[PDB]
RNA sequence: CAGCUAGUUGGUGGGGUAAUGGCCCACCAAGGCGACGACGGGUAGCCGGUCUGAGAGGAUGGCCGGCCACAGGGGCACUGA
RNA sequence: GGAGGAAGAAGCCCUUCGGGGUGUAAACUCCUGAACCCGGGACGAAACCCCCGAGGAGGGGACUGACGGUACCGGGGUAAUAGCGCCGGCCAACUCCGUGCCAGCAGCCGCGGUAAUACGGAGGGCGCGAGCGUUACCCGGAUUCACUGGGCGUAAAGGGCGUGUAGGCGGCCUGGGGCGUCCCAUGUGAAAGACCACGGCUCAACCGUGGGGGAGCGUGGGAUACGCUCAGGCUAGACGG
RNA sequence: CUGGUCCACCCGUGACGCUGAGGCGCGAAAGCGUGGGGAGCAAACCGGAUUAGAUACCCGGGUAGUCCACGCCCUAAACGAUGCGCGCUAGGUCUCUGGGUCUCCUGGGGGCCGAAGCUAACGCGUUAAGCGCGCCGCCUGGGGAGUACGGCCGCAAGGC
RNA sequence: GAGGGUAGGGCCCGUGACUGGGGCGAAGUCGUAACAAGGUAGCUGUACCGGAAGGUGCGGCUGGA
RNA sequence: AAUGUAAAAA
């Protein structure tokens, strides 16, 4: 099927588009532990109805652009900065890495 | 009266003005090839006397061993401080597969099928001591339910 | 080729009677009979404590010279039994004993396993009718081994079969000197065989 | 370490390294003798060894041992290189091969001729 | 803060047995129960029972032991020789029924959580279920 | 190797195609990516499998079969399902 | 080549000069008959094609073999290549001469400086055999990168010490969800290969047929204890008066 | 002026906890910058003596420094050569500090001897190196070497 | 638009008078720092200094009494 | 109160 995923809009600074971050846990291939990883997909929001923090389903879909190959499926919940912070602090601490 | 077999006869030594004199290590195992087994480590200024002495100690310290058709009941790992040894059960036709030391043990033990390895140290002496204990900790189904009963 | 070079020198190296000769090995000199001690300039000298290897080694070398067979082939068979489900040790012997050239000896058609080989090889034997000159041919249970036509009337075959009167043989076998044939009734139980060797020791040798 | 430490950093692979730049890790390499010489052994022994510095196909230039008693190598002998060091001699990671190209076999050796490139005596 | 209440309990039992106490208590908890319940049912402990320390739910765990020994160190053989947590908090272990461990060639037990409940290694196969391998005991 | 990025990320319309698509173009907006390792360098065709190993693992891709890539080096399009 | 074949040829080596060894080995005796020779001589090939039936279904007829006069069968038939590594220890195999830190050996430890089972030759022995050794690289041993399965007072190893971001980990009770997780069902996981069984070529390698399981992912259904997650309560943690 | 910690009461919050890559702050002594201060002591430096020699130990003298402010340096046998947090596992004795009518008990700290157990041994042992879980840091033969190249920091010495 | 040309940077490799230290080497010169109060306890950060090991100052550690 | 190389242990 057109596998659907679920993640929070972390960026809306784009026309008719949104960036969606989704995590996925799983047992490590050698040490078992349930590590978790994430990915950013660019979602097609034709109305620009989905703002930051919205958790959302998004579907595998016809190519829209170079990176846009997923459409926004539906809302899941609104107020969710707590997550947006995580990913944003992550960007922060990058400043304190370079030399 | 049982069977007799020595694992090693090393010549230790000691300093003392004007030269060095030596005693003589001698490790020997003894068993009926039928469950009864005992290890012994004798020392003396004479090779023969040494093995002879190991003979006396051997039959002293002994141990019955629960044999299931030539194999051991359950698998066990036993670390004698330094070295460590594994012991595993095996179907008939497997044979005694182990280092020269635990062989002497298990062979004169009446064992005939067993998977095993020497991890850790390997000092013959300590591996010896180690195995004895290991067998000395084997337990038949009975021993189990007998303890796990306590009626 | 087989071991070609001297045979009765091994009767002497192993220290056990090796019955790879004819009348002679039963005579009052298997060679071993006159000299019960190893070959070479030393032989009768203070024998040393054998290494566990030496001991395990001798045992396998013993068992092989017996069936007189290529080390390569020998090992492969060992492995072949190690695979199949069954008491690996004995089964090995079973495959060994299952060789055609072996059957022929056990069955009295020949006085010597070596000689027997030359009989199979020169095509004097037949399994189930179709001739077989292959010593290595694994005789399955229920095969009729016998002497072929142009073969039946041969001196050696005669004398051997002649002397093969009565003298019962192998519970897994059944002879008929009348018609010069026999049957691989079944695979021999360990007990049926009575080798001077010990399968376990050989099993061990092949762990190294 | 903890499991987690493994899930991060992880286990470093052994990664071993060579003992013989015969290059291409080939089984043997041809070359020409640059210099035939004889050199004193190391710490515990002594006895001037028979050795030669060979220029490789691989543009290199290595020193190599000439095994056996007596030889025929000279300042232009092409020869086959075999690789195998020598405890006795400082930096010598290759044996020459007796019985190939301009390197004769050991004259009159009867035992183990295979390792000294010597034909079967009639 | 106490990391793993389970490993703790198991440990409490191990630390107590070695000195041959009659019964060590343990902070109460529903899931903790089952471990005991099974651990007892199989014959590893005379039993257990809820108690109360200064207003705190706990669990008495009456330890079993072997008969006295003759000779140097009349140390009574243990009834629990071995106990160890498998799945930890820092590494959860999960097994399919088609792959559940056999402790000490069957002499031993391997308690484990499952959709049907906490069950022995054998009871696991019984109802044909896999789950979080908790610990093994022999 | 710790920052990288101008067709760069997204949009609107347009070309092109069997067809989706910054694949290419005009205008617009300022974006996209990075310690979960971007960007940089070194190496390498990939798998079914092969080898060893108690296994977990390690190593490896010859011949056979599957896919990809190339046809002295590089670029181009023509004919045509 | 097979069986017989001396209280045991000669030669050679060793010796306490009696003797011991190579050794049933040889010679010799009989038997068998790879090679070679003569005669026969394949399977792989039935279809397309043509006749009847319509040109179909169905029946019926005939042509073609590179390998090849080869495989194989039959008859005749001569005793008909043995080599290599090693024998101080690991490691199975011991003596003699030569030699003299030289000639040399060497994988590790080490061996040779007049008496070497370690060099080299000999006699003998162990190992394998149309092979046996060497070099090169891979996995093993190596639980010596340790998931299985290691450590860190002094052996190699606790950061100089704190605050703290990210991440990791998270006490007791109940409830909804069911992500992880477990189960079942089905799809997929080609062939070849691996393992099992049985059959084909005199065996075998090789080959055919059949059987089984397989991690993994897709769809559906189900279990909810542990993990998670929303929600509700507590005070044993932590904080506070 | 101010930091930490301990005890009593069981009054408040209601899992708000633990650890911590990078980051940030502290960090003996020596040393660096500007200005100050300078008694005693004292690298370097001079003389004496000892010695074969004596750039040293011993003696007489003696500058920076040692002292302050402000700033920088950031290393160490920065040592218990033992990361932090929590739970569990006999006691004996000495001592610092708190609560309780008290030859006793109950808590927090610092020492010694020891249950069990751990350890290669020495040894550790409710101040664990014992039994367990979480998290970080570190190791993976001796030499070359904490060297070289690169990068970062520094006035420099030099550090990572 | 292949590719050529021009100019300017980056990485990597080879080579270089000379120069720094390092490893190894049956024997050399110098002295004797360490290992026993090693005949001034040693070791250490650092600073000065000296043919060489070293010495000395400040602090620190016992792996010293 | 300095220093004594370099071939000895089945
Ligand atoms: Mg917008
Ligand atoms: Mg899964
Ligand atoms: Mg940079
Ligand atoms: Mg008896
Ligand atoms: Mg008896
Ligand atoms: Mg005896
Ligand atoms: Mg004793
Ligand atoms: Mg006595
Ligand atoms: Mg009994
Ligand atoms: Mg018993
Ligand atoms: Mg240990
Ligand atoms: Mg060793
Ligand atoms: Mg050792
Ligand atoms: Mg017992
Ligand atoms: Mg018993
Ligand atoms: Mg097997
Ligand atoms: Mg197998
Ligand atoms: Mg079996
Ligand atoms: Mg078997
Ligand atoms: Mg019969
Ligand atoms: Mg094996
Ligand atoms: Mg020399
Ligand atoms: Mg010459
Ligand atoms: Mg010449
Ligand atoms: Mg010649
Ligand atoms: Mg040699
Ligand atoms: Mg009691
Ligand atoms: Mg019951
Ligand atoms: Mg632009
Ligand atoms: Mg468009
Ligand atoms: Mg096209
Ligand atoms: Mg583009
Ligand atoms: Mg467009
Ligand atoms: Mg444009
Ligand atoms: Mg890259
Ligand atoms: Mg590869
Ligand atoms: Mg696969
Ligand atoms: Mg693979
Ligand atoms: Mg694979
Ligand atoms: Mg395998
Ligand atoms: Mg694998
Ligand atoms: Mg591996
Ligand atoms: Mg290919
Ligand atoms: Mg290849
Ligand atoms: Mg090819
Ligand atoms: Mg081809
Ligand atoms: Mg090819
Ligand atoms: Mg292919
Ligand atoms: Mg594809
Ligand atoms: Mg091309
Ligand atoms: Mg081209
Ligand atoms: Mg070409
Ligand atoms: Mg071209
Ligand atoms: Mg003969
Ligand atoms: Mg003789
Ligand atoms: Mg004679
Ligand atoms: Mg005759
Ligand atoms: Mg004839
Ligand atoms: Mg021919
Ligand atoms: Mg025909
Ligand atoms: Mg036909
Ligand atoms: Mg045909
Ligand atoms: Mg035909
Ligand atoms: Mg035609
Ligand atoms: Mg008709
Ligand atoms: Mg018609
Ligand atoms: Mg027809
Ligand atoms: Mg037809
Ligand atoms: Mg037809
Ligand atoms: Mg023809
Ligand atoms: Mg023919
Ligand atoms: Mg012809
Ligand atoms: Mg013809
Ligand atoms: Mg013909
Ligand atoms: Mg022919
Ligand atoms: Mg015929
Ligand atoms: Mg013929
Ligand atoms: Mg014929
Ligand atoms: Mg002949
Ligand atoms: Mg003959
Ligand atoms: Mg060899
Ligand atoms: Mg060997
Ligand atoms: Mg030997
Ligand atoms: Mg000479
Ligand atoms: Mg001489
Ligand atoms: Mg000599
Ligand atoms: Mg000598
Ligand atoms: Mg040798
Ligand atoms: Mg020799
Ligand atoms: Mg010889
Ligand atoms: Mg062959
Ligand atoms: Mg390896
Ligand atoms: Mg390795
Ligand atoms: Mg490994
Ligand atoms: Mg270790
Ligand atoms: Mg630790
Ligand atoms: Mg190191
Ligand atoms: Mg810290
Ligand atoms: Mg810190
Ligand atoms: Mg440190
Ligand atoms: Mg630091
Ligand atoms: Mg903290
Ligand atoms: Mg946190
Ligand atoms: Mg929880
Ligand atoms: Mg969490
Ligand atoms: Mg929770
Ligand atoms: Mg819940
Ligand atoms: Mg759900
Ligand atoms: Mg299923
Ligand atoms: Mg697969
Ligand atoms: Mg499937
Ligand atoms: Mg299938
Ligand atoms: Mg397949
Ligand atoms: Mg495999
Ligand atoms: Mg079938
Ligand atoms: Mg068949
Ligand atoms: Mg035939
Ligand atoms: Mg198949
Ligand atoms: Mg199949
Ligand atoms: Mg599989
Ligand atoms: Mg399946
Ligand atoms: Mg999945
Ligand atoms: Mg629930
Ligand atoms: Mg709420
Ligand atoms: Mg709550
Ligand atoms: Mg409280
Ligand atoms: Mg205050
Ligand atoms: Mg109040
Ligand atoms: Mg409340
Ligand atoms: Mg929570
Ligand atoms: Mg400071
Ligand atoms: Mg200062
Ligand atoms: Mg200055
Ligand atoms: Mg200053
Ligand atoms: Mg200035
Ligand atoms: Mg000024
Ligand atoms: Mg000043
Ligand atoms: Mg002054
Ligand atoms: Mg003064
Ligand atoms: Mg001075
Ligand atoms: Mg002076
Ligand atoms: Mg003078
Ligand atoms: Mg003077
Ligand atoms: Mg002074
Ligand atoms: Mg002041
Ligand atoms: Mg002032
Ligand atoms: Mg001031
Ligand atoms: Mg820490
Ligand atoms: Mg804290
Ligand atoms: Mg008080
Ligand atoms: Mg009171
Ligand atoms: Mg009171
Ligand atoms: Mg009170
Ligand atoms: Mg009082
Ligand atoms: Mg008192
Ligand atoms: Mg009290
Ligand atoms: Mg008090
Ligand atoms: Mg205290
Ligand atoms: Mg106290
Ligand atoms: Mg103590
Ligand atoms: Mg004790
Ligand atoms: Mg405490
Ligand atoms: Mg406590
Ligand atoms: Mg205490
Ligand atoms: Mg503690
Ligand atoms: Mg410890
Ligand atoms: Mg320790
Ligand atoms: Mg290293
Ligand atoms: Mg190295
Ligand atoms: Mg190194
Ligand atoms: Mg270093
Ligand atoms: Mg190093
Ligand atoms: Mg430094
Ligand atoms: Mg530096
Ligand atoms: Mg560099
Ligand atoms: Mg460089
Ligand atoms: Mg640098
Ligand atoms: Mg600068
Ligand atoms: Mg300055
Ligand atoms: Mg540091
Ligand atoms: Mg251009
Ligand atoms: Mg250009
Ligand atoms: Mg150009
Ligand atoms: Mg210009
Ligand atoms: Mg340029
Ligand atoms: Mg340059
Ligand atoms: Mg230089
Ligand atoms: Mg230096
Ligand atoms: Mg120098
Ligand atoms: Mg230089
Ligand atoms: Mg130096
Ligand atoms: Mg020198
Ligand atoms: Mg001189
Ligand atoms: Mg010197
Ligand atoms: Mg000197
Ligand atoms: Mg001194
Ligand atoms: Mg002095
Ligand atoms: Mg001292
Ligand atoms: Mg100093
Ligand atoms: Mg001078
Ligand atoms: Mg001081
Ligand atoms: Mg301090
Ligand atoms: Mg000290
Ligand atoms: Mg004193
Ligand atoms: Mg001197
Ligand atoms: Mg000297
Ligand atoms: Mg000396
Ligand atoms: Zn004989």
Curated annotation (Swiss-Prot), chain A:
InterPro entries: NA-bd_OB-fold, Ribosomal_uS17, Ribosomal_uS17_bact/chlr, Ribosomal_uS17_CS
GO biological process entries: translation
Cellular compartments per GO CC: cytosolic small ribosomal subunit
Gene3D superfamilies noted in UniProt: Nucleic acid-binding proteins (2.40.50.140)
CDD domains, per the entry: Ribosomal_uS17
Example of a GO MF term: structural constituent of ribosome
Tagged with keyword Ribosomal protein: yes
Family classification: Belongs to the universal ribosomal protein uS17 family.
NCBIfam families attached to this UniProt entry: PRK05610.1, uS17_bact
Subunit structure: Part of the 30S ribosomal subunit.
Function: One of the primary rRNA binding proteins, it binds specifically to the 5'-end of 16S ribosomal RNA.
UniProt name for this protein: Small ribosomal subunit protein uS17
Organism listed in the record: Thermus thermophilus (strain ATCC BAA-163 / DSM 7039 / HB27)
Lineage, broadest ranks: Bacteria, Thermotogati, Deinococcota, Deinococci, Thermales
Curated annotation (Swiss-Prot), chain C:
Molecular function GO terms recorded: rRNA binding; structural constituent of ribosome; zinc ion binding
Details of cofactor binding: Binds 1 zinc ion per subunit.
Residues of the S4 RNA-binding domain: 99-161
GO cellular component, one term: small ribosomal subunit
GO biological process, one term: translation
Binding residues annotated for Zn(2+), in chain numbering: 8, 11, 25, 30
Zinc finger (C4-type): 8-30
Pfam families associated with the record: Ribosomal_S4, S4
Cofactor(s) listed: Zn(2+)
Gene3D superfamilies found in the cross-reference section: Ribosomal Protein S4 Delta 41, Chain A, domain 1, RNA-binding S4 domain
Keyword terms, alphabetized: Metal-binding, Ribonucleoprotein, Ribosomal protein, RNA-binding, rRNA-binding, Zinc, Zinc-finger
Family: Belongs to the universal ribosomal protein uS4 family.
Function according to Swiss-Prot or TrEMBL: One of the primary rRNA binding proteins, it binds directly to 16S rRNA where it helps nucleate assembly of the body and platform of the 30S subunit.
Subunit structure: Part of the 30S ribosomal subunit. Contacts protein S5. The interaction surface between S4 and S5 is involved in control of translational fidelity.
Name of the protein in question: Small ribosomal subunit protein uS4
From Swiss-Prot, chain D:
UniProt keyword annotations, A-Z: Methylation, Ribonucleoprotein, Ribosomal protein, RNA-binding, rRNA-binding, tRNA-binding
Top-level taxon of origin: Bacteria
GO molecular function: rRNA binding; structural constituent of ribosome; tRNA binding
Keyword Ribosomal protein carried by entry: yes
GO cellular component: a single term: small ribosomal subunit
Chain positions covered by the region annotation Disordered: 105-122
Modified residues (3-methylthioaspartic acid): 88
UniProt cross-references to PROSITE patterns, sorted A to Z: RIBOSOMAL_S12
Xref: Pfam families: Ribosom_S12_S23
Stored CDD domains: Ribosomal_S12
PANTHER family with a match to the protein in the record: 30S RIBOSOMAL PROTEIN S12 FAMILY MEMBER
Family per similarity comment: Belongs to the universal ribosomal protein uS12 family.
Assembly, per entry: Part of the 30S ribosomal subunit. Contacts proteins S8 and S17. May interact with IF1 in the 30S initiation complex.
Role of this protein: With S4 and S5 plays an important role in translational accuracy.
The protein, known as: Small ribosomal subunit protein uS12
From Swiss-Prot, chain E:
Family recorded in the similarity comment: Belongs to the universal ribosomal protein uS8 family.
GO CC, any one term: ribonucleoprotein complex
Gene Ontology terms, MF aspect: rRNA binding; structural constituent of ribosome
Pfam families, per the entry: Ribosomal_S8
Functional summary from the UniProt entry: One of the primary rRNA binding proteins, it binds directly to 16S rRNA central domain where it helps coordinate assembly of the platform of the 30S subunit.
Assembly, per entry: Part of the 30S ribosomal subunit. Contacts proteins S5 and S12.
Protein name, UniProt field: Small ribosomal subunit protein uS8
Gene: rpsH
BP term (GO), one: translation
Matches recorded under InterPro entries: Ribosomal_uS8 (IPR000630), Ribosomal_uS8_CS (IPR047863), Ribosomal_uS8_sf (IPR035987)
Transmembrane domains' residue ranges: none
The keyword Ribosomal protein belongs to this UniProt entry's keyword annotation: yes
Keywords linked to the UniProt accession: Ribonucleoprotein, Ribosomal protein, RNA-binding, rRNA-binding
């Amino acid at each position: 099927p057109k596998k659907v995923l679920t993640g929070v809009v972390v960026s809306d600074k784009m026309q008719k588009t949104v960036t969606v971050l989704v995590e996925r846990q799983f047992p490590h291939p050698l040490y078992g532990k349930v590590i978790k990883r994430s990915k950013k997909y660019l979602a097609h929001d034709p109305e620009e109805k989905y703002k930051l923090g919205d958790v959302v389903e998004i579907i595998e879909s016809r190519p829209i652009s170079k990176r846009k190959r997923f459409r926004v499926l539906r809302l899941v919940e609104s107020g969710r900065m707590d997550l947006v912070e995580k990913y944003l602090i992550r960007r922060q601490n990058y400043q304190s890495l370079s030399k | 009266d049982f069977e007799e077999k020595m694992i090693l006869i090393r010549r230790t030594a000691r300093m003392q003005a004007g030269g060095r004199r030596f005693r003589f290590g001698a490790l020997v195992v003894v068993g009926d090839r039928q469950g009864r087994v005992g290890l012994g480590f004798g020392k003396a200024p004479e090779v023969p006397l040494a093995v002879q002495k190991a003979g006396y100690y051997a039959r002293r310290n002994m141990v019955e061993v629960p044999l299931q058709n030539g194999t051991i009941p359950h698998e066990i790992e036993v670390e004698f401080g330094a070295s460590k040894i594994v012991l595993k059960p095996a179907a008939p036709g497997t044979g005694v597969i182990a280092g020269a030391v635990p062989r002497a043990i298990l062979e004169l033990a009446g064992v005939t099928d067993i998977l095993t390895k020497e991890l850790g140290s390997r000092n013959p002496i300590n591996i010896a001591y180690a195995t004895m204990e290991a067998l000395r900790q084997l337990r038949t189904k009975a021993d189990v339910e007998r303890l796990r009963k306590g009626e | 080729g087989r071991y070609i070079g001297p045979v009765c020198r091994l009767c002497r190296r192993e220290g056990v009677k090796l019955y790879l000769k004819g009348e002679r090995c039963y005579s009052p000199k298997c060679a071993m009979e006159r000299r019960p001690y190893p070959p070479g300039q030393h032989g009768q000298k203070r024998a040393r404590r054998p290494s566990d290897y030496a001991v395990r080694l001798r045992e396998k070398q013993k068992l092989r010279r017996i069936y007189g067979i290529s080390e390569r082939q020998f090992r492969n068979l060992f492995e072949e039994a190690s695979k199949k489900k069954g008491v690996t040790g004995s089964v090995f012997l079973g495959l060994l004993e299952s060789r055609l050239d072996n059957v022929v000896y056990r069955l009295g058609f020949a006085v010597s396993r070596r000689q027997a080989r030359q009989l199979v090889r020169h095509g004097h034997i037949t399994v189930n009718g179709r001739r077989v000159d292959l010593p290595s041919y694994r005789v399955r249970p229920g095969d009729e081994i016998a002497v072929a036509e142009k073969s039946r009337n041969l001196e050696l075959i005669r004398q051997n079969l002649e002397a093969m009167k009565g003298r019962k043989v192998g519970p897994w076998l059944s002879l008929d000197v009348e018609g010069m044939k026999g049957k691989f009734l079944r695979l021999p139980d360990r007990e049926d065989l009575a080798l001077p060797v010990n399968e376990q020791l050989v099993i061990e040798f092949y762990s190294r | 370490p903890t499991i987690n430490q493994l899930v991060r950093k992880g286990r470093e692979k052994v990664r071993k390294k060579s003992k013989v730049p015969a290059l291409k890790g080939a089984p043997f390499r041809r070359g020409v003798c640059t210099v035939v010489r004889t050199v004193t052994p190391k710490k515990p022994n002594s006895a001037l060894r028979k050795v030669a510095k060979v220029r490789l196909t691989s543009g290199y230039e290595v020193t190599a041992y000439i095994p056996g008693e007596g030889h025929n190598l000279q300042e232009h002998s092409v020869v086959l290189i075999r690789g195998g060091r020598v405890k006795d001699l400082p930096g010598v990671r290759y044996h020459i091969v007796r019985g190939v190209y301009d390197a004769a076999g050991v004259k009159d050796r009867k035992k183990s001729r295979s390792k000294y490139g010597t034909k079967k005596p009639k | 803060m106490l990391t793993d209440p389970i490993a703790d309990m198991l440990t409490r039992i191990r630390n107590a047995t070695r000195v041959y106490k009659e019964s060590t208590d343990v902070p109460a908890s529903r899931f903790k129960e089952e471990i005991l319940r099974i651990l007892a049912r199989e014959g590893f402990i005379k039993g257990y029972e809820r108690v109360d320390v200064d207003g705190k739910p706990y669990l008495r765990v009456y330890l079993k032991y072997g008969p006295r020994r003759q000779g140097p160190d009349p140390r009574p053989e243990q009834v629990i020789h071995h106990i160890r947590r498998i799945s930890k908090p820092g590494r959860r272990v999960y097994v399919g029924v088609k792959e559940i461990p056999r402790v000490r060639r069957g002499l031993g037990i391997a308690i484990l959580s499952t959709s049907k409940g906490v069950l022995t290694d054998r009871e696991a196969r019984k109802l044909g279920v896999g789950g979080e391998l908790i610990c093994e005991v022999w």
